[PDB]
Amino acid sequence: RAVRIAVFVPGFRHDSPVYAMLCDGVERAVTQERATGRSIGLDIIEAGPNQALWREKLAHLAAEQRYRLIVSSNPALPHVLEPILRQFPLQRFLVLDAYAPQEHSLITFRYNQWEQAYLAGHLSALVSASAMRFANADKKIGLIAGQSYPVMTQTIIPAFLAGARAVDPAFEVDVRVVGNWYDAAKSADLARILFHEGVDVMMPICGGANQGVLAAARELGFYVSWFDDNGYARAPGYVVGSSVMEQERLAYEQTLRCIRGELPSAGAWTLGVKDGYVRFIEEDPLYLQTVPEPIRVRQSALLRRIQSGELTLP
Ligand SMILES: Cc1cc2nc3c(=O)[nH]c(=O)nc-3n(C[C@H](O)[C@H](O)[C@H](O)CO)c2cc1C
Ligand SMILES: [K+]
Ligand code: NA
Ligand code: NA
């Protein structure tokens, strides 16, 4: 039996870790199963930045009645989908990085981003408190978000702060917002503001604008806590951590289940460190070269406490 899949990207694929990972994993599954001789179609729709059009674009994909599954990502998608689920109940949807319990035609997976961001904040504070080249004597770290949204304000920011405060309760996090997920010039401006306020380690979570923060790091001399995927090679020596979600693998795994007829129609899963889907990347040689022993030792010890449940971050 032939199978057709659509991926709805709420923005652009390139330069957005969550969407690049999503598309890479769906493609990997499709390519794999095509190679067995099976006919599998894959269409990727890049919606672009205009969020006011997302709902109608998704409704048209459902109305086309051709996709066995429409795949998307990000925590706003369940809300976007609400009337579409009602109007087109036979259309199956899969959304990663989201949470929608108790739907009938929508299955979601959320990562434990308290773990993810706590790992990032702890690493950031260790670096900021150290005598590394660009560290200063303040206890100030930064976060530059593309936009504000409930997961960012209720999970990521508080967990980043909590991880930092586990190192020293005096740590502060200065949050800034770009207003979009692409403009690297505008994120660089925020990074310069943070640097001059005394921030020596920043975490960019602003999509294609992340590059602006990397540029500012090289320009001014500060460190970057990278999120979502492996960012060490994007600015060797500046990127001091990668605190990640295993979105490429999850997208691959769930797409395969769809193709083989094993993906449930509904459900809302949460996957974290103990499940293997949130990680701090210690194995990259750039990390080992970039970050001194005492910091790496403490970061490893933290990972062990999360892996055992001793430190549970629900
Ligand atoms: C409405 C909305 C739009 C988003 N757009 C992007 C994006 O274009 N690029 C990106 O890298 N992350 C984007 N994210 C963030 C992403 O889903 C995730 O929360 C962060 O990458 C941290 O894991 C978006 C989040 C929301 C809620
Ligand atoms: K909020
Ligand atoms: Na510091
Ligand atoms: Na210091």
Q: Are residues 31 and 180 in the same domain?
A: no
Tokens of 302: 């933290």
Of 156, 157, 101, the residue nearest 270 (C-alpha) = 101
> Which ligand 1 atom lies nearest to the CA of residue 75?
27
Q: Are residues 207 and 283 in the same domain?
A: yes
| CATH code of 162's domain | 3.40.50.2300
Q: Are residues 62 and 187 in the same domain?
A: no
User: What single-letter DSSP state applies at residue 32?
Assistant: H
Residues facing 42 on adjacent strands:
5
Among 7, 15, 18, residue to substitute to test ligand 1 (most atoms within 8 Å of Cβ): 18
Q: Are residues 216 and 281 in the same domain?
A: yes
Cβ neighbors of 121 (< 8 A, separation 6 or more) are: 141, 159, 160, 161, 162, 163, 164, 165, 166, 173, 225
Measured CA to CA in angstroms, residue 97 lies from 19, 66, 69, 173 at distances of 10, 24, 17, 24
> Which ligand 1 atom lies nearest to the CA of residue 210?
11
> Which ligand 1 atom lies nearest to the CA of residue 156?
22
Of 138, 307, 143, 303, the residue nearest 209 (C-alpha) = 143
Q: What is the number of structural domains in the chain?
A: 2
The closest ligand to the CA of 204 turns out to be 1
Q: Are residues 141 and 6 in the same domain?
A: no
Q: Are residues 208 and 95 in the same domain?
A: no
Tell me how far the alpha carbon of residue 185 lies from the centroid of ligand 1, in angstroms: 18
Please say whether the beta carbons of 279 and 244 come within 8 A: yes
Q: Are residues 123 and 18 in the same domain?
A: no
The span from the CA of 214 to the CA of 204, in Å, is: 9
Of 130, 62, 53, the residue nearest 291 (C-alpha) = 130
Q: Are residues 262 and 301 in the same domain?
A: no
Tell me how far the alpha carbon of residue 171 lies from the centroid of ligand 3, in angstroms: 9
Q: Are residues 100 and 123 in the same domain?
A: no
Of 277, 273, 258, 266, the residue nearest 303 (C-alpha) = 273
Among 16, 183, 206, 271, residue to substitute to test ligand 1 (most atoms within 8 Å of Cβ): 16
Q: Are residues 128 and 78 in the same domain?
A: no
Among 51, 53, 74, 277, residue to substitute to test ligand 1 (most atoms within 8 Å of Cβ): 74
Domain housing 123? 112-245+272-314
- As a residue count, the chain comes to 314
β pairing state of 140-145 and 172-177 = parallel
Question: Could you tell me the strand order of the sheet in which 40-46 lies?
Answer: 40-46, 3-9, 69-73, 93-96, 106-111, 267-271
The span from the CA of 223 to the CA of 239, in Å, is: 6
User: What single-letter DSSP state applies at residue 238?
Assistant: T
Nearest CA to ligand 1 atom 17: 74
The span from the CA of 314 to the CA of 113, in Å, is: 9
Q: Are residues 118 and 228 in the same domain?
A: yes
Please say whether the beta carbons of 313 and 116 come within 8 A: no
Q: Are residues 286 and 186 in the same domain?
A: yes
The span from the CA of 139 to the CA of 57, in Å, is: 45
Torsion 131-135-136-140 (CA) sign: negative
